[PDB]
Sequence to fold (614 residues):
Amino acid sequence: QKLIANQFNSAIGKIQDSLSSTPSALGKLQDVVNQNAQALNTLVKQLSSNFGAISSVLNDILSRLCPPEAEVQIDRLITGRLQSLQTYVTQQLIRAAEIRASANLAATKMSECVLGQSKRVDFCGKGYHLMSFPQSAPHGVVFLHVTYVPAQEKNFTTAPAICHDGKAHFPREGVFVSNGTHWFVTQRNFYEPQIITTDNTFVSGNCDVVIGIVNNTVYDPLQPELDS
Amino acid sequence: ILPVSMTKTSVDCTMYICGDSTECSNLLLQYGSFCTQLNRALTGIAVEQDKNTQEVFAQVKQIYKTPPIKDFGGFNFSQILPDPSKPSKRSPIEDLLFNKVTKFNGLTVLPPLLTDEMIAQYTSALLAGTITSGWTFGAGPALQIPFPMQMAYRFNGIGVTQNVLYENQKLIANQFNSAIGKIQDSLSSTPSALGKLQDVVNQNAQALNTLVKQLSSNFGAISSVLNDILSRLCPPEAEVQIDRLITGRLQSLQTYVTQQLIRAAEIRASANLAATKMSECVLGQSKRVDFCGKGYHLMSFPQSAPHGVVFLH
Amino acid sequence: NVFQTRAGCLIGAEHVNNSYECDIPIGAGICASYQTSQSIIAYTMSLGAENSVAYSNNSIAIPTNFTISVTTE
Fold:
């Protein structure tokens, strides 16, 4: 518990170093600021365009000309500025659909990663998901996905079953493994070798049926209780 | 079969609208930043197709490779693993998937960042990791495990007791090998199976052909051809005729780029789904009903295809 | 310093036989980066470190320890 607590505390500590040292990390939220600022800067700059009128400025047309020709020059600015707005609103509708797809994903990671624990691989970060913490950010959310990553492999010889009194034994939970001379049953995601027993294993059939079954004793805990 | 990317087109809108004409290009400047924001949109779509492809295939940080000897306990991956005999080392199924899916006007096609041979190195790495180490290469270090014992864990994952595999291992291996064999017959006999990837090729080719053919339209000008106006007329009236062509060719491009932005959003949603099937079906085992095919999911294999990925669930 | 990529002719970038993670993406498997005496280099991108999993019909790797990772999304 102290190792796991200190690894968690240290990994939460590294998040501030990571976000402080990496300007590209927030780049997904900063690009949402940049695209919408650039869309308005492009919309505003299009008021400087002539679109084929005698001026880009509507008050030049209205102060120089009179209705027979002024309304012809104005309708070139109306046509161009209306096409400039229709372009912007079309881009903002497509951009809003992308932000909504991201908000639906963020709402799904809130339910499944934060309010739960996720069995979905790589949904709540790389590793076997433990839990996630939401942090707010400008235009977004940030999830600190806590995950168990296995870290220090050992190679073991392994078997699908053990054959005892002709009975084939399989592990209830875990794997059979050997250190090279002795056979143990271990849980799969962390090495914790236990003696092979009638409590750790279940029988089905006999040695004839299973390819790669190994002959080993299986301890029956009732035996010394009857013999004592 | 899932589409994952589409052809990275880019259109030089000054040459599409005003093809090598300074007389027209000086009029096209009066419409301001429409031509620069059409290029910005098509560049954003084209960069996204490399992201869509990267998110699906580049889920593995190390290029895992299979052992020389194939001691998989009767299971036979030869039709999904690479074939070294080929000019590019695709699998026997990826060779079917690549066979069954089939310019001067400023329109161009940019190459994808990852070549088909890099996509095949990623599907090989995903697949060699899957076969030799189970889900473990997605969740942490690749941990070797015998393939009969991996399938026995996949059986516990569906609530079927693992002795059901070890006592039926030859049957399950023969059913697996035969079911993988039927995939090649399905893909070879039924070329419309790839129709979801061919539809992505066809819609992009049809949108480019519609964009090219809109250069033949007058839009109300005395000719569809810009060099007719500039050889017959002079600046008081040539500009009146060219503004009809600029307006029509600009509206022709805005219609293409709008429909390519909506079509890119459909391919992105399909690439996000394919990236999720890679993580949850290939790098894992999925409890999600009918997500990784019909039946209780055991495992999946990615195979690359033109503009897409194919999962053998 | 003049190099034919399948994306086009690349000029002013030094072609390099090594491969690295893709820094600036050029296309058709080519990338470029700025590196050491400094130049823009151009290279075929590396997909990842190559690995062989030590598979055999009776070997399993079991992890004897863990790390509590925290990944920011």
Notes: Residues 156 and 305 of chain B are 32 Å apart (CA to CA). The two ends of chain B are 11 Å apart (CA to CA). The beta strands of chain B are 2-3, 8-11, 62-65, 107-110, 301-305, 308-312. The longest strand of chain B covers residues 301-305.
